[PDB]
């Protein structure tokens, strides 16, 4: 039945850890750092969206044309299929047109 | 496992609710649950009823014998209550009898004494006391307190009221609590007698009048198993009561009860008590 | 009827005109309500304490 | 629905209008948290209103706990043993005042 | 140390005496302290004698010595609401307990 009978062990969150005690340090490296850097180039993560936002279709196009020659074969086929589908959907399906 | 914490706590509260509706704990004295300071509660008891006791007297009015003996026994590891209680019961019987004599003049002393000892009986006094929060403050050795210690304590409270603020105020106290309890209660539900027609002839002879002659006023369904017989008592061609029943004999008896009520001025159409 | 048609003509013109002017003022008067500093800084006391 | 729930007949406690009137509520028991958002509306009620409620009818003993919890509640103990529990979490001043007055004005 | 502070009456005279050490012109209560060094000297003397130092968010409101006098004539009740509720002489039918 959709409910439990024993309280889970109470999670201990250390609100004063390292990665919580500095969240945002150097998040203003430009306005007061002579504009040498940009916060864009502080955010770790994928090479194809270091500082970029788009919908799913644009994101997968960027993934293809920026890292789509180093990615494994089956993944690449899935990705091309995904582009084909999202093209069909975004361009021929919906209420507004 | 569904990750989360709200439903677990709601379910724990529901299960503790069910478990405390199934196996309720042994009832314990309200002076051992949390949120209890005695002095404030006594003063609030005083103010609730719209009286101004003497706090020392009202404290002495709850120190029963049993608690004193038990505490004395435990001291191996204080005034008493009998005085105030005895004064209280004395005044209660006197003033209740005076009230009922004033309001009801045509009743014998046996009926008046029965009504008095009913309105100071164990059951009714216990009802009033329980619905006046007296046993919460009562000191005894066993909870729930037995009706005996409870009755004694309620009359000890009335005694302290007397000795603090006068017979007239105490009279209105008794009027407000005890004398009210005979509202709705018919007479013979309070004065348990048997063989009514005997007391009827006794009373009518004490008034120098013939033993009353009974006849059959109304009759419907004589043969069946649901009959209605109306029996009318008479006093020499004039009628003093009638009554219904399912036998002519029960009809006789209840017409006797009706006539006995009418003579004693205790019918259901009487002027209500004037508060 | 009391007044022949030629008599009633324009008798209540002033009342209608002022009623319609009240309508016009009500219509023209719509605009965003004000915004006070007190609201924004009194939301800041959902963290009151005792100490 | 009526069939699916209990019922009763109109009643008083001890014929509570003949001789006099006695306030039926003996006790109120407030529990508040000194540092916790849920008790905020209750906290000020202990600062502003409770003193005037305590004086405005003196037959009620009012206890306030002030524990280091996160939830409030008010227990209303009556003469005839009935306990009315009420929840005041995430409430405000006016509604808590209305609730406590409603408790202290019913059997 | 503690915060609690109640204005001594002689404080009034004290203020003038301190002003005399760091300023001779009458109408003394309306001296203007926009000269920062003198302001620091006066406020430091008042702080080290009376044990109550002006807050940072109030140091610009007081530009005249009259404002120093006005600020020092306000008391501070350094007590939680527990102590004030207790000290408010509660009626007979109210009891408060505080588990600290």
Coordinates of C-alpha atoms in Angstrom, one line a residue:
Chain A
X1 CA 0.0 0.0 0.0
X2 CA 1.3 3.4 -1.0
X3 CA 2.8 4.4 2.4
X4 CA 5.6 3.3 4.6
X5 CA 5.7 2.3 8.3
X6 CA 9.2 3.4 9.5
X7 CA 10.6 6.8 9.4
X8 CA 13.8 7.0 7.2
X9 CA 17.1 7.7 9.0
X10 CA 17.3 11.5 9.4
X11 CA 19.7 12.8 6.8
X12 CA 22.4 15.0 8.2
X13 CA 23.0 18.0 5.9
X14 CA 26.1 20.0 6.8
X15 CA 24.9 23.5 5.8
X16 CA 28.4 24.8 6.5
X17 CA 30.4 22.5 4.2
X18 CA 33.0 23.7 1.7
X19 CA 30.8 23.6 -1.4
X20 CA 27.9 25.3 0.4
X21 CA 30.1 27.9 2.2
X22 CA 31.3 29.4 -1.1
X23 CA 28.4 29.1 -3.5
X24 CA 28.9 32.2 -5.6
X25 CA 32.4 33.2 -4.6
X26 CA 33.8 34.7 -7.8
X27 CA 30.3 34.8 -9.3
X28 CA 31.1 38.5 -9.9
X29 CA 34.5 38.2 -11.4
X30 CA 33.7 40.7 -14.1
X31 CA 32.0 43.8 -12.6
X32 CA 34.8 44.0 -10.0
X33 CA 37.8 42.2 -11.6
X34 CA 38.7 44.6 -14.5
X35 CA 36.5 42.4 -16.8
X36 CA 39.4 40.1 -17.4
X37 CA 37.1 37.0 -17.1
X38 CA 33.4 36.4 -17.5
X39 CA 31.2 34.2 -15.3
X40 CA 30.5 32.1 -18.4
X41 CA 34.0 30.7 -18.1
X42 CA 33.6 29.7 -14.4
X43 CA 30.8 27.1 -14.9
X44 CA 32.1 23.5 -15.3
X45 CA 30.2 21.0 -17.4
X46 CA 29.6 19.9 -20.9
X47 CA 31.7 21.4 -23.7
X48 CA 28.6 22.1 -25.8
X49 CA 26.7 24.2 -23.2
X50 CA 29.4 26.1 -21.3
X51 CA 27.3 29.2 -21.2
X52 CA 24.4 28.6 -23.6
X53 CA 20.7 27.9 -23.4
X54 CA 18.3 26.5 -25.9
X55 CA 15.4 24.2 -26.3
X56 CA 15.9 20.4 -26.7
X57 CA 16.2 20.6 -30.5
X58 CA 18.9 23.3 -30.5
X59 CA 20.7 21.6 -27.7
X60 CA 20.9 18.4 -29.7
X61 CA 22.0 20.2 -32.8
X62 CA 24.8 21.8 -30.8
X63 CA 25.8 18.5 -29.3
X64 CA 26.0 17.0 -32.8
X65 CA 27.9 19.8 -34.6
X66 CA 30.3 20.3 -31.6
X67 CA 31.0 16.9 -30.3
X68 CA 29.2 14.7 -32.8
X69 CA 32.4 13.3 -34.2
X70 CA 33.8 11.8 -31.0
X71 CA 30.6 10.2 -29.8
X72 CA 29.9 6.4 -29.9
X73 CA 28.1 5.1 -32.9
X74 CA 24.8 4.0 -31.3
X75 CA 24.6 7.2 -29.4
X76 CA 25.1 9.2 -32.6
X77 CA 22.4 7.2 -34.3
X78 CA 20.0 7.9 -31.4
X79 CA 20.9 11.6 -31.6
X80 CA 20.3 11.9 -35.4
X81 CA 16.9 10.1 -34.8
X82 CA 16.1 12.6 -32.1
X83 CA 16.9 15.5 -34.3
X84 CA 14.6 14.1 -37.0
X85 CA 11.8 13.6 -34.5
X86 CA 12.1 17.0 -32.8
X87 CA 12.2 18.7 -36.2
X88 CA 9.0 17.0 -37.2
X89 CA 7.3 17.9 -33.9
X90 CA 8.4 21.5 -33.5
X91 CA 7.7 22.3 -37.2
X92 CA 4.4 20.4 -37.8
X93 CA 2.7 19.8 -34.4
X94 CA 1.1 22.0 -31.9
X95 CA -1.9 24.3 -31.3
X96 CA -0.4 27.7 -32.3
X97 CA 0.3 28.3 -36.0
Chain B
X1 CA 11.5 3.3 -1.3
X2 CA 9.5 6.4 -2.2
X3 CA 11.8 9.2 -1.0
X4 CA 10.0 11.5 1.3
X5 CA 9.1 12.3 4.9
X6 CA 5.7 13.9 5.2
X7 CA 3.5 10.9 4.7
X8 CA 5.5 8.8 7.2
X9 CA 4.8 11.3 9.9
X10 CA 1.1 11.7 9.1
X11 CA 0.9 7.9 9.2
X12 CA 2.7 7.7 12.5
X13 CA 0.2 10.2 14.0
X14 CA -2.7 8.3 12.5
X15 CA -1.5 5.0 14.0
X16 CA -0.9 6.6 17.4
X17 CA -4.4 8.0 17.2
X18 CA -5.8 4.5 16.5
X19 CA -3.7 2.9 19.2
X20 CA -4.9 5.4 21.7
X21 CA -8.5 4.9 20.7
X22 CA -8.0 1.1 21.0
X23 CA -6.0 0.7 24.2
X24 CA -6.6 4.0 26.1
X25 CA -4.2 4.5 28.9
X26 CA -5.3 3.9 32.5
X27 CA -7.1 7.0 33.6
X28 CA -4.8 9.0 35.9
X29 CA -5.4 12.0 38.2
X30 CA -5.5 15.3 36.5
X31 CA -2.9 16.5 39.0
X32 CA -0.3 14.3 37.3
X33 CA -0.8 15.3 33.7
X34 CA 1.1 18.3 32.3
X35 CA -0.2 21.8 32.6
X36 CA -1.2 21.8 36.3
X37 CA -0.5 24.3 39.1
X38 CA -2.8 23.8 42.1
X39 CA -3.1 27.3 43.5
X40 CA -4.2 28.8 40.2
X41 CA -6.7 26.1 39.7
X42 CA -8.3 26.5 43.1
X43 CA -8.6 30.3 42.6
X44 CA -10.2 29.6 39.2
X45 CA -12.6 27.2 40.8
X46 CA -13.6 30.0 43.2
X47 CA -14.1 32.5 40.5
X48 CA -16.0 30.2 38.1
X49 CA -18.9 29.8 40.5
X50 CA -19.1 33.6 41.2
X51 CA -18.2 33.2 44.9
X52 CA -15.2 34.4 47.0
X53 CA -14.2 31.6 49.3
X54 CA -11.5 31.9 51.9
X55 CA -8.6 30.2 50.1
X56 CA -7.3 28.5 53.3
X57 CA -10.8 27.1 53.9
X58 CA -11.3 26.0 50.3
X59 CA -7.9 24.3 50.5
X60 CA -8.8 22.5 53.7
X61 CA -12.1 21.5 52.1
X62 CA -10.4 19.0 49.7
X63 CA -7.9 17.3 52.1
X64 CA -9.8 14.1 52.7
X65 CA -8.9 11.5 55.4
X66 CA -7.6 9.0 52.9
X67 CA -4.9 11.3 51.4
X68 CA -3.7 12.3 54.8
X69 CA -3.4 8.7 56.0
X70 CA -1.6 7.7 52.8
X71 CA 0.9 10.6 53.0
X72 CA 1.5 9.8 56.7
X73 CA 2.2 6.2 55.6
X74 CA 4.6 7.3 52.9
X75 CA 6.5 9.7 55.2
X76 CA 8.3 6.7 56.7
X77 CA 10.2 6.4 53.4
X78 CA -2.2 19.2 58.2
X79 CA -5.8 19.9 59.0
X80 CA -8.6 17.4 58.1
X81 CA -11.8 17.5 56.1
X82 CA -14.4 15.9 58.3
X83 CA -15.2 19.1 60.2
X84 CA -16.1 21.3 57.2
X85 CA -17.9 18.4 55.5
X86 CA -20.1 17.7 58.6
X87 CA -21.0 21.4 58.9
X88 CA -21.8 21.4 55.2
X89 CA -24.1 18.4 55.2
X90 CA -25.9 19.7 58.3
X91 CA -26.5 23.0 56.6
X92 CA -27.5 21.3 53.3
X93 CA -30.2 19.1 54.9
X94 CA -31.5 22.0 56.9
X95 CA -31.7 24.5 54.1
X96 CA -33.0 22.1 51.5
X97 CA -35.8 21.1 53.9
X98 CA -36.6 24.7 54.5
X99 CA -36.7 25.5 50.8
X100 CA -39.0 22.5 50.0
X101 CA -41.2 23.3 52.9
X102 CA -41.6 26.8 51.7
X103 CA -42.3 26.0 48.0
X104 CA -44.4 22.8 48.7
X105 CA -46.6 23.2 51.8
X106 CA -48.9 20.2 51.4
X107 CA -46.3 17.4 51.6
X108 CA -45.6 15.2 54.6
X109 CA -42.2 15.1 56.3
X110 CA -41.5 11.6 54.9
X111 CA -41.8 12.9 51.3
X112 CA -39.8 16.0 52.1
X113 CA -37.1 14.0 53.8
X114 CA -37.0 11.6 50.8
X115 CA -36.6 14.6 48.4
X116 CA -33.9 16.1 50.6
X117 CA -31.9 12.9 50.8
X118 CA -32.3 12.5 47.1
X119 CA -31.0 16.0 46.4
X120 CA -28.2 15.2 48.7
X121 CA -28.0 11.6 47.5
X122 CA -24.9 10.0 46.2
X123 CA -25.8 9.9 42.5
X124 CA -27.1 13.5 42.1
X125 CA -24.4 15.0 44.3
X126 CA -21.8 13.1 42.3
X127 CA -23.3 14.4 39.0
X128 CA -23.1 18.0 40.1
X129 CA -19.7 17.5 41.6
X130 CA -18.3 15.9 38.5
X131 CA -19.7 18.6 36.3
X132 CA -18.2 21.2 38.7
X133 CA -14.6 19.9 38.4
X134 CA -14.4 19.2 42.1
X135 CA -12.8 15.8 41.8
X136 CA -9.9 17.3 39.8
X137 CA -8.8 19.2 42.9
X138 CA -9.9 16.5 45.3
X139 CA -7.1 14.8 47.2
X140 CA -7.6 11.1 47.9
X141 CA -5.8 7.8 47.5
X142 CA -7.6 6.1 44.6
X143 CA -8.5 7.7 41.2
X144 CA -11.3 7.9 40.1
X145 CA -12.4 9.0 43.5
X146 CA -15.3 6.9 44.9
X147 CA -18.7 8.6 45.1
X148 CA -18.4 8.6 48.9
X149 CA -15.3 10.8 49.2
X150 CA -16.7 12.8 46.3
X151 CA -20.0 13.5 48.1
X152 CA -18.1 14.4 51.3
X153 CA -15.9 16.8 49.4
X154 CA -18.7 18.6 47.7
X155 CA -20.4 19.2 51.0
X156 CA -17.1 20.3 52.4
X157 CA -16.9 22.9 49.7
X158 CA -20.4 24.1 50.6
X159 CA -19.3 24.2 54.3
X160 CA -16.4 26.3 53.4
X161 CA -18.7 28.6 51.5
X162 CA -20.9 28.9 54.5
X163 CA -18.1 29.6 57.0
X164 CA -16.6 32.1 54.5
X165 CA -19.6 34.2 53.1
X166 CA -22.7 33.5 55.0
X167 CA -26.0 31.5 55.1
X168 CA -27.8 33.6 52.5
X169 CA -25.0 33.2 49.8
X170 CA -24.7 29.5 50.6
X171 CA -28.5 29.2 50.3
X172 CA -28.4 30.6 46.8
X173 CA -25.5 28.3 46.0
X174 CA -27.5 25.2 47.0
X175 CA -30.5 26.7 45.2
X176 CA -28.4 27.1 42.0
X177 CA -26.9 23.6 42.0
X178 CA -28.7 21.0 44.1
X179 CA -32.3 22.2 44.0
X180 CA -32.1 22.6 40.2
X181 CA -31.5 18.8 39.8
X182 CA -35.2 18.1 40.5
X183 CA -36.2 19.9 37.3
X184 CA -38.0 17.6 34.9
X185 CA -37.8 14.8 37.4
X186 CA -41.3 13.9 38.3
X187 CA -42.2 13.3 42.0
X188 CA -42.4 9.6 42.3
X189 CA -39.2 9.1 40.3
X190 CA -37.5 10.8 43.3
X191 CA -39.6 9.5 46.1
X192 CA -39.5 5.7 45.7
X193 CA -42.6 4.3 47.3
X194 CA -44.6 1.1 46.8
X195 CA -48.4 0.4 47.2
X196 CA -49.6 4.0 46.4
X197 CA -53.3 3.5 47.2
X198 CA -52.5 2.7 50.8
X199 CA -50.8 6.1 51.2
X200 CA -53.7 7.6 49.4
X201 CA -56.3 6.3 51.8
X202 CA -54.0 7.2 54.7
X203 CA -53.8 10.8 53.6
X204 CA -57.5 11.1 52.8
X205 CA -58.4 9.7 56.2
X206 CA -56.0 12.1 57.9
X207 CA -58.1 14.7 56.2
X208 CA -61.3 13.0 57.4
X209 CA -62.7 11.8 54.1
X210 CA -63.9 8.4 52.9
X211 CA -61.7 5.9 51.2
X212 CA -62.0 6.8 47.6
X213 CA -64.1 4.7 45.2
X214 CA -62.7 3.7 41.9
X215 CA -64.6 3.3 38.6
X216 CA -63.9 2.7 34.9
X217 CA -63.9 5.9 32.8
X218 CA -62.7 4.9 29.3
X219 CA -62.1 1.4 27.9
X220 CA -60.7 0.6 24.4
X221 CA -59.7 -2.9 23.3
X222 CA -60.8 -5.0 26.3
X223 CA -60.0 -8.4 24.9
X224 CA -56.8 -7.9 23.0
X225 CA -53.2 -7.9 24.2
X226 CA -52.9 -4.1 23.8
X227 CA -55.7 -2.7 26.0
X228 CA -56.1 0.8 27.4
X229 CA -58.1 1.2 30.6
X230 CA -58.8 4.5 32.3
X231 CA -59.5 4.2 36.0
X232 CA -61.0 7.1 37.8
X233 CA -60.8 7.5 41.6
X234 CA -63.8 9.3 43.1
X235 CA -64.5 11.0 46.4
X236 CA -68.3 10.8 46.9
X237 CA -69.6 11.7 43.5
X238 CA -66.6 14.1 42.7
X239 CA -63.5 13.0 40.9
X240 CA -60.0 13.6 42.2
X241 CA -57.9 11.8 39.6
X242 CA -57.9 9.4 36.7
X243 CA -55.1 7.3 35.1
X244 CA -54.3 5.1 32.1
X245 CA -52.9 1.6 32.0
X246 CA -52.9 -1.7 30.2
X247 CA -54.7 -3.4 33.1
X248 CA -57.5 -2.1 35.3
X249 CA -55.1 -2.8 38.3
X250 CA -52.1 -0.8 36.9
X251 CA -54.7 1.9 36.0
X252 CA -55.9 1.9 39.6
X253 CA -52.3 2.2 40.9
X254 CA -51.3 5.0 38.6
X255 CA -54.6 6.9 39.2
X256 CA -53.6 6.6 42.8
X257 CA -50.2 8.1 42.0
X258 CA -52.0 10.9 40.1
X259 CA -54.3 11.7 43.0
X260 CA -51.5 11.6 45.5
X261 CA -49.6 14.1 43.3
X262 CA -52.5 16.4 43.0
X263 CA -53.1 16.5 46.8
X264 CA -49.4 17.1 47.6
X265 CA -49.3 20.0 45.1
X266 CA -46.5 18.5 43.0
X267 CA -48.2 18.0 39.7
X268 CA -46.6 18.7 36.3
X269 CA -48.6 22.0 35.9
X270 CA -47.1 23.5 39.1
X271 CA -45.7 27.0 39.1
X272 CA -42.0 26.5 38.2
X273 CA -39.5 27.3 40.8
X274 CA -38.7 31.0 41.0
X275 CA -35.0 31.6 40.5
Chain C
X1 CA -49.9 60.9 -18.9
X2 CA -48.9 64.1 -17.1
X3 CA -46.8 65.9 -19.7
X4 CA -47.5 65.9 -23.4
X5 CA -44.4 64.9 -25.4
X6 CA -43.6 68.5 -26.3
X7 CA -43.4 69.4 -22.6
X8 CA -41.0 66.8 -21.3
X9 CA -38.4 67.6 -23.9
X10 CA -35.0 67.9 -22.2
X11 CA -36.3 68.4 -18.7
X12 CA -33.9 65.8 -17.2
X13 CA -30.9 66.6 -19.5
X14 CA -28.7 67.8 -16.7
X15 CA -29.1 64.7 -14.6
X16 CA -28.3 62.4 -17.5
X17 CA -25.3 64.5 -18.5
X18 CA -23.8 64.4 -15.0
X19 CA -24.5 60.6 -14.7
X20 CA -22.7 60.0 -18.0
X21 CA -19.9 62.2 -16.8
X22 CA -19.6 60.1 -13.7
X23 CA -19.4 57.0 -16.0
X24 CA -16.7 58.7 -18.0
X25 CA -14.6 59.6 -15.0
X26 CA -14.9 56.0 -13.7
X27 CA -13.8 54.7 -17.1
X28 CA -10.9 57.1 -17.4
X29 CA -9.7 56.6 -13.8
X30 CA -8.3 53.0 -14.2
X31 CA -4.6 52.8 -13.5
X32 CA -2.2 50.5 -11.5
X33 CA -2.4 50.9 -7.7
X34 CA 0.4 52.4 -5.7
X35 CA 3.3 50.4 -4.3
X36 CA 4.6 51.2 -0.8
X37 CA 7.9 50.4 0.9
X38 CA 6.1 49.1 3.9
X39 CA 4.7 46.0 2.2
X40 CA 8.1 44.9 0.8
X41 CA 9.8 45.4 4.1
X42 CA 7.1 43.9 6.2
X43 CA 7.2 40.7 4.3
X44 CA 10.7 40.5 5.9
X45 CA 9.3 39.5 9.3
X46 CA 8.5 35.8 8.5
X47 CA 11.6 35.1 10.5
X48 CA 10.8 36.7 13.8
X49 CA 12.3 35.1 16.9
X50 CA 12.3 35.4 20.7
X51 CA 15.6 35.9 22.5
Chain D
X1 CA -23.8 13.3 6.0
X2 CA -26.4 12.8 8.7
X3 CA -26.9 9.1 8.6
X4 CA -23.2 8.4 8.5
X5 CA -22.4 10.4 11.6
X6 CA -23.6 10.6 15.2
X7 CA -26.2 12.9 16.7
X8 CA -27.6 14.1 20.0
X9 CA -30.4 16.1 21.6
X10 CA -30.1 19.7 22.6
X11 CA -28.5 19.9 26.0
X12 CA -26.8 22.0 28.6
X13 CA -24.3 20.7 31.2
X14 CA -26.0 21.2 34.6
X15 CA -29.1 23.2 33.7
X16 CA -26.7 26.0 33.3
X17 CA -29.1 28.9 33.0
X18 CA -31.6 28.3 35.9
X19 CA -29.6 29.2 38.9
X20 CA -26.8 31.0 37.1
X21 CA -24.3 30.7 34.3
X22 CA -20.9 29.1 34.8
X23 CA -18.3 29.3 32.1
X24 CA -17.8 25.8 30.8
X25 CA -14.1 26.1 29.8
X26 CA -11.8 25.4 32.8
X27 CA -8.4 25.4 31.0
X28 CA -6.6 26.5 27.9
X29 CA -3.1 25.1 27.1
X30 CA -1.1 27.0 24.5
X31 CA 2.1 25.5 23.2
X32 CA 4.4 27.8 21.2
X33 CA 7.8 27.6 19.7
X34 CA 10.2 30.5 20.5
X35 CA 12.1 30.2 17.1
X36 CA 9.9 28.7 14.4
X37 CA 7.8 30.2 11.7
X38 CA 4.7 28.1 12.2
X39 CA 4.0 29.6 15.6
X40 CA 4.5 33.2 14.5
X41 CA 0.8 34.1 14.6
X42 CA 0.6 32.4 18.1
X43 CA 3.7 34.1 19.4
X44 CA 2.3 37.6 19.2
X45 CA -1.0 36.3 20.7
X46 CA 1.1 35.6 23.9
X47 CA 2.4 39.2 23.7
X48 CA -0.6 41.3 22.7
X49 CA -3.9 39.5 23.4
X50 CA -3.5 36.7 26.0
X51 CA -3.2 39.1 28.9
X52 CA -6.5 40.8 28.1
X53 CA -8.2 37.5 27.4
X54 CA -6.9 36.2 30.7
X55 CA -8.4 39.2 32.6
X56 CA -11.6 39.4 30.4
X57 CA -12.9 36.2 31.9
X58 CA -11.0 34.9 35.0
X59 CA -12.5 31.5 35.6
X60 CA -10.2 29.9 32.9
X61 CA -6.6 28.9 33.9
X62 CA -4.4 29.6 30.9
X63 CA -1.1 27.7 30.6
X64 CA 1.5 28.5 27.9
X65 CA 4.4 26.1 27.4
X66 CA 7.0 27.8 25.1
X67 CA 8.8 24.6 24.1
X68 CA 11.6 24.5 21.5
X69 CA 9.3 22.6 19.0
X70 CA 8.1 23.6 15.5
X71 CA 4.3 23.2 15.9
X72 CA 1.7 25.0 18.0
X73 CA -1.7 23.8 19.3
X74 CA -4.3 24.8 21.8
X75 CA -6.0 22.3 24.2
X76 CA -9.4 23.4 25.6
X77 CA -10.4 21.4 28.7
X78 CA -14.0 21.8 29.8
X79 CA -15.8 21.2 33.0
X80 CA -17.3 17.9 31.9
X81 CA -14.0 16.3 30.8
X82 CA -14.4 17.0 27.1
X83 CA -11.1 18.1 25.5
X84 CA -11.2 20.2 22.3
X85 CA -7.9 20.1 20.5
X86 CA -7.4 22.8 17.9
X87 CA -4.5 23.5 15.5
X88 CA -3.1 27.0 15.1
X89 CA -0.1 26.3 12.9
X90 CA 0.4 28.8 10.1
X91 CA -2.3 31.0 11.4
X92 CA -2.4 34.7 12.3
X93 CA -3.6 37.1 15.0
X94 CA -7.2 37.7 14.2
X95 CA -8.0 34.1 13.5
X96 CA -6.4 32.8 16.7
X97 CA -8.3 35.4 18.7
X98 CA -11.5 34.3 17.0
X99 CA -10.6 30.6 17.8
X100 CA -9.9 31.2 21.5
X101 CA -13.0 33.2 21.9
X102 CA -15.0 30.5 20.2
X103 CA -13.6 27.9 22.5
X104 CA -14.2 30.0 25.6
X105 CA -17.8 30.7 24.5
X106 CA -19.2 27.1 23.9
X107 CA -19.9 24.1 26.1
Chain E
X1 CA 29.7 41.8 28.8
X2 CA 26.1 42.9 28.7
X3 CA 24.1 45.4 26.6
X4 CA 21.7 46.8 29.2
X5 CA 21.9 50.6 29.7
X6 CA 19.7 53.1 31.5
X7 CA 20.5 56.9 31.2
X8 CA 22.2 58.3 34.3
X9 CA 20.9 61.8 34.9
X10 CA 24.4 63.3 35.6
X11 CA 25.1 62.1 32.0
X12 CA 23.7 65.4 30.9
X13 CA 26.4 67.3 32.8
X14 CA 29.0 64.6 31.8
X15 CA 28.3 65.4 28.1
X16 CA 29.1 69.0 28.4
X17 CA 32.3 68.3 30.4
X18 CA 33.5 66.0 27.6
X19 CA 32.6 68.6 25.0
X20 CA 34.7 71.1 26.9
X21 CA 37.7 68.9 26.6
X22 CA 37.4 68.8 22.8
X23 CA 36.1 72.3 21.9
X24 CA 34.1 77.8 25.1
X25 CA 31.4 78.7 22.6
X26 CA 28.0 78.7 24.3
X27 CA 24.8 77.3 22.7
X28 CA 27.0 74.2 23.1
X29 CA 24.2 71.7 22.5
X30 CA 24.1 72.8 18.9
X31 CA 27.7 72.3 18.1
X32 CA 28.2 70.6 14.7
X33 CA 30.6 67.7 14.6
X34 CA 31.1 67.3 10.8
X35 CA 34.8 67.6 11.6
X36 CA 35.3 63.8 11.8
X37 CA 38.3 63.8 14.2
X38 CA 36.4 65.7 16.9
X39 CA 33.3 63.4 16.5
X40 CA 35.5 60.4 17.0
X41 CA 37.1 61.8 20.1
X42 CA 33.8 62.7 21.7
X43 CA 32.0 59.5 20.9
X44 CA 35.0 57.4 22.1
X45 CA 35.0 59.2 25.4
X46 CA 31.3 58.8 25.9
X47 CA 31.6 55.1 24.9
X48 CA 34.5 54.3 27.2
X49 CA 32.9 56.1 30.2
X50 CA 29.2 55.1 29.8
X51 CA 29.7 51.7 28.3
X52 CA 27.4 52.2 25.3
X53 CA 28.8 52.8 21.8
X54 CA 26.6 54.2 19.0
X55 CA 25.6 51.8 16.2
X56 CA 27.0 52.1 12.7
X57 CA 23.5 52.6 11.3
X58 CA 22.9 55.5 13.6
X59 CA 26.2 57.3 13.4
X60 CA 25.1 59.5 10.4
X61 CA 21.7 60.5 11.9
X62 CA 23.6 62.3 14.7
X63 CA 25.5 65.3 13.1
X64 CA 24.8 67.8 16.0
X65 CA 25.7 67.3 19.6
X66 CA 22.0 67.6 20.4
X67 CA 21.6 64.3 18.6
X68 CA 24.2 62.7 20.8
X69 CA 22.3 63.9 23.9
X70 CA 19.0 62.7 22.4
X71 CA 20.4 59.2 21.6
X72 CA 21.9 58.8 25.0
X73 CA 18.5 59.6 26.6
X74 CA 16.8 56.4 25.3
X75 CA 17.0 53.2 27.3
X76 CA 17.6 49.6 26.0
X77 CA 15.8 46.7 27.7
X78 CA 18.3 43.9 27.1
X79 CA 15.9 41.0 27.8
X80 CA 14.0 38.4 25.8
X81 CA 10.2 38.6 25.8
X82 CA 10.2 35.9 28.5
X83 CA 11.5 38.3 31.1
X84 CA 9.2 41.2 30.2
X85 CA 6.1 38.9 30.1
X86 CA 7.1 37.6 33.5
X87 CA 7.8 41.1 34.9
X88 CA 4.4 42.4 33.6
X89 CA 2.7 41.1 36.8
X90 CA 0.4 38.7 35.1
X91 CA -3.1 38.1 36.5
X92 CA -3.8 35.2 38.8
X93 CA -5.2 33.0 36.1
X94 CA -2.2 32.8 33.7
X95 CA 1.0 30.8 34.1
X96 CA 4.0 30.7 31.7
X97 CA 6.9 28.3 31.8
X98 CA 10.0 28.5 29.6
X99 CA 12.2 25.5 29.1
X100 CA 15.6 27.3 29.0

